[PDB]
């Protein structure tokens, strides 16, 4: 592709429906995980009160729960380093 732009289609809705599927099969509890997938498609927008909770609270459940206590700062610090590099690029 040349000069791509952010766009939505039913495919992302159906790929959002496979994230629901991963959550539900992984947790044997569809209702709670359905909320955590709505919390991953809503980071595509990054809504003001819901812009930081999103991807982290998603990356929590799918593997064994409670094994992400240490990896969560790893993801957060790598994101912080990413913004540090972006801030350097802006400067």
Curated annotation (Swiss-Prot):
Name of this chain's protein? Mitochondrial import receptor subunit TOM20 homolog
- Which is one GO molecular function term here? unfolded protein binding
Q: Which residues of the full protein are shown?
A: 55 to 145 of 145
| Residues with Phosphoserine modification | 81, 84
Ordered alphabetically, the record's keywords are:
Isopeptide bond, Membrane, Mitochondrion, Mitochondrion outer membrane, Phosphoprotein, Protein transport, Transmembrane, Transmembrane helix, Transport, Ubl conjugation
Please state the protein's primary subcellular location: mitochondrion
Instruction: Supply the gene name.
Output: TOMM20
What are the subcellular locations of this protein? Mitochondrion outer membrane
Q: Cross-link Glycyl lysine isopeptide (Lys-Gly) (interchain with G-Cter in ubiquitin) maps to which residues of the chain?
A: 2, 7, 14
Cytoplasmic topology ranges:
1-91
Q: How does it assemble?
A: Forms part of the preprotein translocase complex of the outer mitochondrial membrane (TOM complex) which consists of at least 7 different proteins (TOMM5, TOMM6, TOMM7, TOMM20, TOMM22, TOMM40 and TOMM70). Interacts with TOM22. Interacts with APEX1. Interacts with TBC1D21. Upon mitochondrial depolarization, interacts with PINK1; the interaction is required for PINK1-TOM-TIM23 supercomplex formation which is critical for PINK1 stabilization at the outer mitochondrial membrane, kinase activation and downstream mitophagy.
Q: How is it modified after translation?
A: Ubiquitinated by PRKN during mitophagy, leading to its degradation and enhancement of mitophagy. Deubiquitinated by USP30.
Q: How does it sit in the membrane?
A: Single-pass membrane protein
The family this protein is said to belong to: Belongs to the Tom20 family.
**Organism listed in the record:** Homo sapiens (Human)
Q: What does this protein do?
A: Central component of the receptor complex responsible for the recognition and translocation of cytosolically synthesized mitochondrial preproteins. Together with TOM22 functions as the transit peptide receptor at the surface of the mitochondrion outer membrane and facilitates the movement of preproteins into the TOM40 translocation pore. Required for the translocation across the mitochondrial outer membrane of cytochrome P450 monooxygenases.
Instruction: Please cite one Gene Ontology biological process associated with this protein.
Output: tRNA import into mitochondrion
**What are the annotated GO cellular component locations?**
cell periphery; migrasome; mitochondria-associated endoplasmic reticulum membrane contact site; mitochondrial outer membrane; mitochondrial outer membrane translocase complex; mitochondrion; sperm midpiece; TOM complex
């Amino acid at each position: 592709s040349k000069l791509p732009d952010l766009k939505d289609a039913e495919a992302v809705q159906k790929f959002f429906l496979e994230e629901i599927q991963l959550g539900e099969e992984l947790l044997a509890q569809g209702e709670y995980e359905k909320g955590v997938d709505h919390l991953t498609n809503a980071i595509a927008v990054c809504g003001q009160p819901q812009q930081l909770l999103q991807v982290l609270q998603q990356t929590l459940p799918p593997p064994v729960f409670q094994m992400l206590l240490t990896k969560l700062p790893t993801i957060s610090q790598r994101i912080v380093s990413a913004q540090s590099l972006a801030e350097d690029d802006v400067e």
